[PDB]
Amino acid sequence: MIEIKDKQLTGLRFIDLFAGLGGFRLALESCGAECVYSNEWDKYAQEVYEMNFGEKPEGDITQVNEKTIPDHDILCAGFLFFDIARIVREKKPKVVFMENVKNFASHDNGNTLEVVKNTMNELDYSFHAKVLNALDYGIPQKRERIYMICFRNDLNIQNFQFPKPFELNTFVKDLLLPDSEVEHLVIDRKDLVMTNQEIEQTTPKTVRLGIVGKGGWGERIYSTRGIAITLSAYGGGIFAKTGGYLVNGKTRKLHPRECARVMGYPDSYKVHPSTSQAYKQFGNSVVINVLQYIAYNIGSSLNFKPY
Numbered sequence: 001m002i003e004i005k006d007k008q009l010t011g012l013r014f015i016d017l018f019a020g021l022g023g024f025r026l027a028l029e030s031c032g033a034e035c036v037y038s039n040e041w042d043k044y045a046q047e048v049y050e051m052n053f054g055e056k057p058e059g060d061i062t063q064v065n066e067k068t069i070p071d072h073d074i075l076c077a078g079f080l081f082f083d084i085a086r087i088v089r090e091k092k093p094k095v096v097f098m099e100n101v102k103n104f105a106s107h108d109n110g111n112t113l114e115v116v117k118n119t120m121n122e123l124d125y126s127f128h129a130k131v132l133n134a135l136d137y138g139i140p141q142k143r144e145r146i147y148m149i150c151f152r153n154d155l156n157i158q159n160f161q162f163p164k165p166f167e168l169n170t171f172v173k174d175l176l177l178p179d180s181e182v183e184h185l186v187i188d189r190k191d192l193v194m195t196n197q198e199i200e201q202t203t204p205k206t207v208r209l210g211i212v213g214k215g216g217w218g219e220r221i222y223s224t225r226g227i228a229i230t231l232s233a234y235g236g237g238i239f240a241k242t243g244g245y246l247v248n249g250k251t252r253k254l255h256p257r258e259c260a261r262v263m264g265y266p267d268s269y270k271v272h273p274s275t276s277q278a279y280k281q282f283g284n285s286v287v288i289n290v291l292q293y294i295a296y297n298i299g300s301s302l303n304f305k306p307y
């Protein structure tokens with residue numbers, strides 16, 4: 001996670017739609033924005049959030065009244081979407097910050113997106129979309145999520161600019177817990193196949209040192225000198241969720257706390273005790289660092305009011 005000095009968001013207040021773990025809250029808040037709402041039905045989700053944010057993210061949005069959402073300047077939802085609009089039409093915030101999965105743009109040959117986008121314009125908001133790999137922002141991980149920044153045209157914001165990518169210098173190897181602490185994470189497997197051999201120095205691209213089993217989903221081991229592959233919250237394999245990583249001879253899955261650091265979360269974040277869950281949580285959450293950037297530049301555009 002990044003420590004942002006200029007709270008280019010101090011004023012504005014946002015709601016955490018589809019809360020999750022508060023990836024967005026973490027972010028904007030750094031930017032100084034204030035969180036007025038949050039909703040999330042997942043019990044263990046509602047659990048962690050509250051653990052680190054002292055509130056139970058209001059239940060299932062589907063039945064929640066948009067005439068109930070507080071007034072905000074940013075609605076963050078990394079998802080039904082029709083609830084957003086539903087709300088985004090009622091509470092018409094200034095900026096509507098969203099983010100989703102890589103394939104969101106392409107899906108159904110652009111339907112999903114043609115819909116959403118147009119559901120924004122027919123809703124009166126500029127639509128900005130672009131995909132960024134966490135790795136491209138001081139984050140060691142092959143993650144590709146979509147980021148949609150929408151502006152209520154009234155603001156006439158013709159200058160927002162997604163963050164400019166930058167080489168990184170922090171790899172998985174860097175975010176691991178003192179082996180002693182990851183011992184219960186090993187998995188002695190006789191059927192290991194070293195499709196490849198260890199690497200010198202480091203590199204940003206996900207080094208698949210070797211697979212296990214039919215070597216498919218959650219059936220691969222990556223080095224620690226590469227970048228943690230896409231954490232999944234629904235994966236199935238022997239090295240699911242996090243995947244397996246060649247950590248000193250023995251091969252082990254990544255630790256929840258490790259997941260975090262690799263998700264951009266700060267270490268202070270109280271992660272859910274249901275390791276199974278946490279994983280799923282992180283598999284579903286967002287890369288903070290990136291969020292922080294986009295956030296910044298979001299406020300940084302709102303703040304450029306000349307004469």
Ligand SMILES: Nc1ncnc2c1ncn2[C@@H]1O[C@H](CSCC[C@H](N)C(=O)O)[C@@H](O)[C@H]1O
Pocket residue numbers: 018019020021022023024039040041042045059060061062077078079281284285286
């Ligand atoms: N109808 C609904 N009501 C409330 N929460 C819902 C919902 N449908 C899905 N969700 C929740 O919305 C989230 C979409 S995943 C969102 C990522 C989140 N921003 C993060 O920081 O982790 C999941 O937590 C999912 O359980």
